[PDB]
Amino acid sequence: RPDFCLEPPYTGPCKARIIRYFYNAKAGLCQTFVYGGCRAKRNNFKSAEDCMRTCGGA
Amino acid sequence: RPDFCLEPPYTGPCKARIIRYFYNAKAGLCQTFVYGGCRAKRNNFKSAEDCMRTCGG
Amino acid sequence: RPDFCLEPPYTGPCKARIIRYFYNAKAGLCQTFVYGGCRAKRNNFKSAEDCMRTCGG
Amino acid sequence: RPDFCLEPPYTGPCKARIIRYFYNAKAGLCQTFVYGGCRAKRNNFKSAEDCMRTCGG
Amino acid sequence: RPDFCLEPPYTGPCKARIIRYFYNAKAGLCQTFVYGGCRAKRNNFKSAEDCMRTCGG
Amino acid sequence: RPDFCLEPPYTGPCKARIIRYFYNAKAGLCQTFVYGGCRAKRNNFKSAEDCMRTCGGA
Amino acid sequence: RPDFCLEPPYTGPCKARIIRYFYNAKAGLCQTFVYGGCRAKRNNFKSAEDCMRTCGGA
Amino acid sequence: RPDFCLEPPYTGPCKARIIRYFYNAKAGLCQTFVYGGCRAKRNNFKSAEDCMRTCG
Amino acid sequence: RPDFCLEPPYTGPCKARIIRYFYNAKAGLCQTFVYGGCRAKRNNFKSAEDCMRTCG
Amino acid sequence: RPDFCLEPPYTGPCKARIIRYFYNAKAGLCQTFVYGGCRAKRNNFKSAEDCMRTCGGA
Ligand SMILES: [Hg+2]
Ligand SMILES: [Hg+2]
Ligand SMILES: [Hg+2]
Ligand SMILES: [Hg+2]
Ligand SMILES: [Hg+2]
Ligand SMILES: [Hg+2]
Ligand SMILES: [Hg+2]
Ligand SMILES: [Hg+2]
Ligand SMILES: [Hg+2]
Ligand SMILES: [Hg+2]
């Protein structure tokens, strides 16, 4: 998996309350977090399918 | 039916207000609850189809 | 993990070609398959989040 | 539970292949079927939430 | 028509502000209301198609 | 309601098999039909909410 | 086009913050507005395709 | 109005049958067409909001 | 690239909190911003496909 | 960017006709392809936002 999959989730400075997915390398799966709407980092997926595929395997 | 289906719904600490589904054992069907956006337990489904099949029967 | 997470994915006899998710116990991850639209088995999820969470651990 | 919940699912004459939900009384939950796109009967829900609440209990 | 189609719409005690559909028996049509996310009554539809079809006739 | 709400549903010449809604003035509600993807007439709604509101009352 | 296409957008008294489309007759196209979730008037569409087709032309 | 807004809708060579939106310069509005799933030209919108705003 | 692609994202005066896409000319790609629900400028896409194709 | 962003799009052996996004490294952006529903490779995204963020830059 890409190293960015090891990043902690990043809400960002904006004020929306949007459900996004991040890879939790300890749990070995993707989990939800609240994304603020701007300045996303790469461990942030709109689709849980994309999170699993991008980050699931190494 | 998995045992996690018997747990009460868990909103969690986060501040989003997102519709999710949980199995209500007492009622014998899936129902809606408000999910906060993080730290979900297993009695938590984005899709009602998934909730029924996983926790029903 | 629910035992149904260990079932091979099941398309069924119907003629739709719908993306669904199943847990691959060998690979230890959810993957897509083509669902026919009827007679689903339990290792079949509309949502990928539901697949990962229900069939993880 | 409305009586229409006890009818078998009805695909109809049209040629689309669309996932819908119907209540399976024998099984005591909603299930998927393929809907053709026209001439629907009432045991036909776009949303699984709607199916459970309308036909469950 | 199911009798539950005659219930006034019910927001419930939860704090989400989600669009749902209800049948207005007086007007003879489905209309929107704001659903709070928990303790739904049956005159509550995620899909407008489901509302019209379930509560029509 | 607009007169176009009295039109019979129109699939059109294209080959997609898309669910759309039309107002059935006899039934007094909107029903599904299969839309082909092109050359829509006005009694054709992507959302069933829009069909009810646009065509429901006179 | 139906005369309801000439009305200003109507949020209504309810407290949701939902994106809907209204036809802007001066602009000749549909635009977004915030709908409150109840007491809709007819110049209010869930889908932009529906808005533009219904209030399309003359 | 971007010049690509005046181009005819392009289905392309692929075999999917998916509703997309295109701006019809003559009609003065966005309409539906069938998109094959690959090699999209720019007069091709998944969202009708985007079509009207971009091309209208 | 249409010139509107070079404009900064515009939230507007309305009170909704909705994810939209804008083309960031500097970064050379589309990114998310919060849109208030009214008075959208053209560098505003509901679909990221439309943003990349239109502005990329 | 992850090296999987360099692979050509992969339809796979299954028979569905689903729209997915792949990163076109030469073009510098994501484009649509038809996915068959199984045996996905990693340059395959349900959401265009995810594709562009994951395979974004270098
Ligand atoms: Hg996967
Ligand atoms: Hg089921
Ligand atoms: Hg999870
Ligand atoms: Hg329910
Ligand atoms: Hg109907
Ligand atoms: Hg209505
Ligand atoms: Hg149109
Ligand atoms: Hg617009
Ligand atoms: Hg593109
Ligand atoms: Hg991005």
Curated annotation (Swiss-Prot), chains A, F, G, J:
Residues 5-55 form the BPTI/Kunitz inhibitor domain. One of its GO terms (molecular function) is potassium channel inhibitor activity. Its main location: secreted. The record marks 15-16 as: Reactive bond for trypsin. Disulfide bonds join 5-55, 14-38, 30-51. One of its GO terms (cellular component) is extracellular space. Transmembrane segments: none annotated. One of its GO terms (biological process) is negative regulation of thrombin-activated receptor signaling pathway. Keywords: Disulfide bond, Pharmaceutical, Protease inhibitor, Secreted, Serine protease inhibitor, Signal. It is found in: Secreted. It comes from the Eukaryota. Inhibits trypsin, kallikrein, chymotrypsin, and plasmin. This is Pancreatic trypsin inhibitor. It comes from Bos taurus. The chain holds residues 36 to 93 of 100 of the full protein.
Swiss-Prot record, chains H, I:
Keywords: Disulfide bond, Pharmaceutical, Protease inhibitor, Secreted, Serine protease inhibitor, Signal. The keyword Cytoplasm does not apply. Disulfide bonds join 5-55, 14-38, 30-51. It comes from the Eukaryota. GO terms for cellular component: extracellular space; serine protease inhibitor complex. GO terms for biological process: negative regulation of platelet aggregation; negative regulation of serine-type endopeptidase activity; negative regulation of thrombin-activated receptor signaling pathway; trypsinogen activation. Residues 5-55 form the BPTI/Kunitz inhibitor domain. The record marks 15-16 as: Reactive bond for trypsin. GO terms for molecular function: calcium ion binding; molecular function inhibitor activity; potassium channel inhibitor activity; protease binding; serine-type endopeptidase inhibitor activity; sulfate binding; zymogen binding. It is found in: Secreted. Inhibits trypsin, kallikrein, chymotrypsin, and plasmin. This is Pancreatic trypsin inhibitor.
